[PDB]
Amino acid sequence: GADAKTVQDTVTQVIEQNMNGIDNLMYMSSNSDSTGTVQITLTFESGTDADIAQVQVQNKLQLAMPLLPQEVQQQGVSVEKSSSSFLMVVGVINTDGTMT
Amino acid sequence: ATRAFSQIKDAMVFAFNLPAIVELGTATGFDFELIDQAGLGHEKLTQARNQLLAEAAKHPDMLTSVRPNGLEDTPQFKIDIDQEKAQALGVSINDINTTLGAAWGGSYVNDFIDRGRVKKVYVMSEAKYRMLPDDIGDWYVRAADGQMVPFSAFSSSRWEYGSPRLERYNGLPSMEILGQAAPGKSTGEAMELMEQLASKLPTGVGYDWTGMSYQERLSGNQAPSLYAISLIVVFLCLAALYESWSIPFS
Amino acid sequence: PNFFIDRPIFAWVIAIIIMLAGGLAILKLPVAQYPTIAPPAVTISASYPGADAKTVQDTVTQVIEQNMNGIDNLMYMSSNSDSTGTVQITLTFESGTDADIAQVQVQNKLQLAMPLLPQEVQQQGVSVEKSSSSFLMVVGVINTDGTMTQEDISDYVAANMKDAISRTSGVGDVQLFGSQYAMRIWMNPNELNKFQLTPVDVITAIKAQNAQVAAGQLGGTPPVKGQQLNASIIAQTRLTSTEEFGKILLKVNQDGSRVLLRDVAKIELGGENYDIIAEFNGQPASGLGIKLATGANALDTAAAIRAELAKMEPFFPSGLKIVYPYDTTPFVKISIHEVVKTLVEAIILVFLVMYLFLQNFRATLIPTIAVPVVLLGTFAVLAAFGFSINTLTMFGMVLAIGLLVDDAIVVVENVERVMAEEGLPPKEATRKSMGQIQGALVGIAMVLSAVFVPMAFFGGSTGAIYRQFSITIVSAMALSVLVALILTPALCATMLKPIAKGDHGEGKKGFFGWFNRMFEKSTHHYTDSVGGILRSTGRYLVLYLIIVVGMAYLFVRLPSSFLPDEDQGVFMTMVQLPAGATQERTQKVLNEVTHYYLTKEKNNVESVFAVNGFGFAGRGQNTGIAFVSLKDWADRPGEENKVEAITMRATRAFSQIKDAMVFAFNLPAIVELGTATGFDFELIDQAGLGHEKLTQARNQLLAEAAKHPDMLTSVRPNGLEDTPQFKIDIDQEKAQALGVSINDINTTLGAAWGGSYVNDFIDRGRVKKVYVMSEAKYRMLPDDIGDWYVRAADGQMVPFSAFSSSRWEYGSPRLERYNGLPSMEILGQAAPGKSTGEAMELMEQLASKLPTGVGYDWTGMSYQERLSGNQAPSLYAISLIVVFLCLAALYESWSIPFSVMLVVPLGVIGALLAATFRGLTNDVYFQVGLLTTIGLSAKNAILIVEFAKDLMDKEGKGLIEATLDAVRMRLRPILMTSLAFILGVMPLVISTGAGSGAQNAVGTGVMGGMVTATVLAIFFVPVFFVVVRRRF
Amino acid sequence: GMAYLFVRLPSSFLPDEDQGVFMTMVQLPAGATQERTQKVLNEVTHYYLT
């Protein structure tokens, strides 16, 4: 429920400062939402080790963990090596209308 | 489709084809960012991004669509807790915050287990009691003695502003941009007539390039430096075979 | 071999190609200092606010050194544990290891460990990195106009500049010299006692008022039917200014009136800590101490920094210049040019000795045109194999002009000879010349890499160091073979101008004819006399064995080096004190120091960058590093201005009148590579005897190791010694009876005397830390305790002295531990007669004389097995095993390859002189250069032998009527090559200033070798061959 | 002639294909309701199904 300026000053910045010394780092976004949600993308060099690319972020997310408020900690952070756009979608519906 | 939607509409909606190859959206125009390299804060930076757009739309002959990406500054209901008053009534500040937080935003508590899989338990004020300003003074807290207090007894409530989407590029606050290269000159020129209007700005704000338009591309830069090296080495093959420097030309 | 001798161009193509090739390799290839040579350094750090080291080592340390395990290629584990709190734990990994997952398997076991360490250590942030081991380069900052101070500059940097630097493609660990600003609340106990307040209350009110809040929304999702609006709610927000931090409301006193923070504490926007303060040439200054992340090209990383401050320059404050005190970039990008320089003098110098002899331009351009091609080509094989342009590899380049020189020279000369003899047009002459040296040259392609290859498989630190050379040349070598087979001879077909049948052009020039008479005639005298040794075949043989005994005698007199110390223009000096003497007592030290460098050594010293309260051992208030810089080489002509002299005489000025232990040194050759200078012992508590007996045991060792000052000196402890500690013992029973919470008591001491981390306020758009800590005056001396008052179960204050004892006892500010268990590290050196290989064993044994439980072990700089004295003469064996294994094949005798091999000594006993007579040493560069001379030595002989063979088998002449014509028909190729090489290695052997330290080992060795390896080769090889032959 | 032609043609990368699958995005005077939004999707889903 938190507003974005009580998201960007309490979860965001405590990452964008504990993040560093990372191989082939290229740059770092930060979309910070009035929903709470807070992406931080780190692009890496083309042809890079996709994997440890994903890793050296994890380490500096852990040296960062117990700085973010308790709720953010218990609400779960989520680091991934995701793509950037939709692969495919899987639609589901109700025939008989026994659900909503 | 677009000429049907927006030609009679209230809000900004349009349909597109997804750029060639999923993810490979590094072709369609340019992408600018604006960085707070002096700690001037956001409120001046919304303001600076103003002056750029306003003085970049002055040339509709080298670039159009010089517009911000994401969202703009909505208004925000602000509650300022009169500590002195609230403390004097003997009500815990810890209480006050959680009862607003958990009322208007919801709180994560325990994890009950429905049917053999744990799911989350959310406590949050029922729907009707959380829609409008005055809905605040319905909310009551328990005190040091043991009696309730309205929020309005210990709160201010004023209409001001804020940004729902605060961006930041490489740690520092920044404001991203999305326009395109006008139908006569390339991004290789629509880039430079935007690398400079940014200098016309106030002290502290900076420029930088990121993502889809940070590279150097095909023809117009370095393809005719490899093309060179293609038809350098073709000649380098022939003379050997023809025992002449003046035959591989043929 | 022939395709091209008829067809000039098909060479020209493949030629052009490896020219174009290595060209696009100079470019796309990372220019570096040396290789990646560091054994994969990992480094866990962690802090604990104000806490003493024994409440650091038992609460953060041990909860790691036990949750750490199952980790790939683990080698060993340090543990420096500081009275500052700070707590390094280094895990070294195997050389060549996966630097990355090396760093990773530590992270995993740091996470299975996280919530065991106290809350503060957790919230204060742990920091695991894959850092280097020593300083890459430093970035000085200062104030011009003087509108800011010795922590305002640190701040501007730390908030504007450091928070980008650390995020740039493998920048392991940046160390800020000082601190980013921090909201400091300076607690006053007078003002706390009166108003009935604990630091507890001060802490809670901070966590109450200055905090960003869980919000909510109007038009909340989900909504009750059609609303119009939706807006985020803002509540309370983190405070921005000293002003509103003072505003915080604590109490509401008896008579309505308010007690705000301003009233109990002086609020100050200051630093996160006050131990590290740096002074660039004495002016208040902050810095950036950049460090590498193993497997990192630094001539890359520091060339793109630059690419972060070439963006922070316009958006500064008024007057804030950058200054460069410590840079390893001006050097290696000069060391480079200055070998590339040598490799064009090396060309221009050959362009002459090449000319003199053949005295004809359009011929000379042949053994000239070769150079570029093979070199450019070398650049190529490198790039696409596994290496990067560097010092070691750049020398090999100069060192490889040799195995390029000859087979060009000898093909070209070959045709001179062929045109001096029969009368065959340049073309015909070449195939008559080449089909007459074809396999010979394809011989020296394998036999001379047979000494070169094996040393590539060197172990440890020396490994890649040797792998550079023993391949950089090998490539250069085999590419001079395929060249001198395909382009060289082809060119010999084309631009080589025809010469009358039986000419030499004796006298017939005036200019150079009076120059040719001095040779052709003297070469007749040569041969008439090589017939004169061959009569008296014995008497010279007996001269030879003497040379060998002589040689061996010389080989055992020279001392053992690795890679010689260079003058770098950048050196440093360290400052130590009777530990726990004040930061201020320390500044008087740095001041005496910065003085000397800016007083007497003004001549040379450019800029000192002294840092107070930071040690090249570890942290404290009595630790100092003074980063010097010198002027630009040329402005320091002689030995007195070179580092060796300065530092030496520097110490004899400092300590000769001083109170504390301070001395300056040159940083060991190659950053990080500090694995050369002596030994390193550790002492382990393998019975749980505890520290207090182990300080004691380390006593008895030193005391009974200084008993032999004839096998080892400096047997001394490393780090720090046992300071005293103020101990407060809380009488629970009493304290509980007064009804005061133990939770209260501890926090009000902890937060008073060590400081506490609380909230994170946000100054100017970047969160920084809020530190509450007792004001300065109320925390200096013992009795300052009983000023401190706590609030009780009823509601009235109590002095600490009512419920405390306070006694003066001891402790250690630096508790070490090697591989989990407590240990005490040692630092002495190998006395000037016997090596570490013996100073190690006379210390592996005095340790047995110790009490039950204490143990020995070796770690770091002295855990390996090294160059000469162990396993170099087991590869040397395998070098000259396989050289012999090449030859017999070619000569169809087991008793002929001796003839060529017996030359090995003839070059050595010259190179050993150079090395002896000039104050020099036996080290890598030398052993490399030694290897080189062993190659040329056979190369020269191999020919004389091969032809001798040739004219006995393919033309069937007697033993004596052959060797002669061999020693004669190719004497010139030798003298030529010899004189070219010596006058083409000539530069290095002079040279000053820039990286010449190496350039002389490389040179001196090769020269003095290549001298004797000829004016002896030209005699003894015929006395070899013939006497090797008169034993069928 | 050739060169003249070579400089008249415009710069593409890899030409946009028809994919059978495309998409459309919906934006509003932000912080107008989820419900105000649904009236948008409804006008939209309409056009494609009308």
Ligand SMILES: C[C@H](CCC(=O)O)[C@H]1CC[C@H]2[C@@H]3CC[C@@H]4C[C@H](O)CC[C@]4(C)[C@H]3C[C@H](O)[C@]12C
């Ligand atoms: C950059 C915006 C997207 C708006 C945003 O950034 O949020 C882009 C996405 C595709 C763009 C339109 C494509 C077709 C048209 C091309 C014309 O030569 C200029 C006007 C039009 C009508 C464009 C206007 C605008 O430039 C749009 C809508």
Ligand SMILES: C[C@H](CCC(=O)O)[C@H]1CC[C@H]2[C@@H]3CC[C@@H]4C[C@H](O)CC[C@]4(C)[C@H]3C[C@H](O)[C@]12C
């Ligand atoms: C091992 C110590 C460092 C002290 C420490 O470990 O803290 C070393 C660092 C360089 C060493 C000095 C180098 C020059 C001298 C060489 C002599 O052959 C022995 C005495 C001297 C004067 C040495 C004394 C001592 O051995 C020093 C000072």
